[PDB]
Amino acid sequence: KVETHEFTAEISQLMSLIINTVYSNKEIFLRELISNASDALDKIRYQALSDPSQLESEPELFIRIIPQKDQKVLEIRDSGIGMTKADLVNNLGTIAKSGTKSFMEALSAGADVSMIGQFGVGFYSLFLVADHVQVISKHNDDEQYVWESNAGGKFTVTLDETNERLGRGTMLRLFLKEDQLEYLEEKRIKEVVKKHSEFVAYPIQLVVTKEVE
Ligand SMILES: CCNC(=O)c1cc2c(-c3cc(OCCN4CCCC4)c(Cl)cc3Cl)nc(N)nc2s1
Structure with missing residues (x-):
């Protein structure tokens, strides 16, 4: 059951700008x-302070990076608060019009692409390294859904009947560009995490697949 929606024009504009920029420090997508x-x-920790039962859907609080070399995909999963179906339509491709507009003005004046997070739209930095993304999300008291975009003007939202269950949280599935496959490598991923994400309150887990020999 696939629903199609249109991006707020300014968000479409930003995606095209980012997916085409030739910027040289693309690794900052992962920090964002x-x-x-x-x-x-x-946010889920905040709610859990009042209501500890909110954690029961996924009691471990974590960030997990899962390279899928077979698919040329990099997944970034968290057990955070997640997003409902309405959130996915709204937060992504509607809200943040204001931040996208200001960021684009800053870029024209000379701003470093790396200050995208200061305008609240760092999510879209993923198009530095990916040409296609799926956002899978599960919020307490709603079903699991998949939002999908290819940096054009349309996105879809679908009940998720094909991915592993998240329990609670969000998983971004980045379909990497052919020149950016370095971000599937254990050594590269560790470098970037250690450089740019030292002060993170949650464990950052890296899933690595090794042959037994
Ligand atoms: C509905 C309550 N939950 C959320 O809004 C969440 C938003 C995200 C996001 C997120 C945040 C995002 O925005 C960051 C916050 N800015 C948005 C507007 C100003 C602040 C965007 Cl544009 C896209 C995504 Cl997928 N990522 C992840 N991993 N988890 C969550 S949970």
Whole structure:
């Protein structure tokens, strides 16, 4: 059951700008997504202070990076508060019009792409390294859904009947560009995490697949 929706024009504009920029420090995308994951974890932790039962859907609080070399996909999963179906339509491709507009003005004046997070739209930095993204999300008291975009003007939201269950949280599935496959490598991922994400309150877990020999 696939619903199609249109991006707020300014958000479409930003995605095209980012997916085409030739910027040289693309590794900062990972800091931005980890930062979004930390913030989502802050929110479920806030609710859990009043109501500890909110954690029961996924009791471990974590950020997990899962390279899928077979698929040329990098996944970033958290057990944060997550997003309902309405959130996915709204937060993504509607809200943040204001931040996208200001960021684009700053870019024209010379701003570093790396200050995207200061306008609240660092999520879209993923298009530095990916040409296609799926956002899978599960909020307490709603079903699991998949939001999907290819940096054009349309996105879809679907009940998720094909991915592992998240329990609670969000998983971004980045379909990496052919020149950015370095971010599937354990050594590269560790470098970037250690450089740019030292002060994160939650464990950052790296899933690595090794042959037994
Ligand atoms: C509905 C309550 N939960 C949320 O809004 C969440 C938003 C996210 C996000 C997120 C945040 C995002 O925005 C960051 C916050 N800014 C948005 C507007 C100003 C602040 C964007 Cl544009 C996209 C996404 Cl997928 N990422 C992740 N990993 N988890 C959550 S949970």
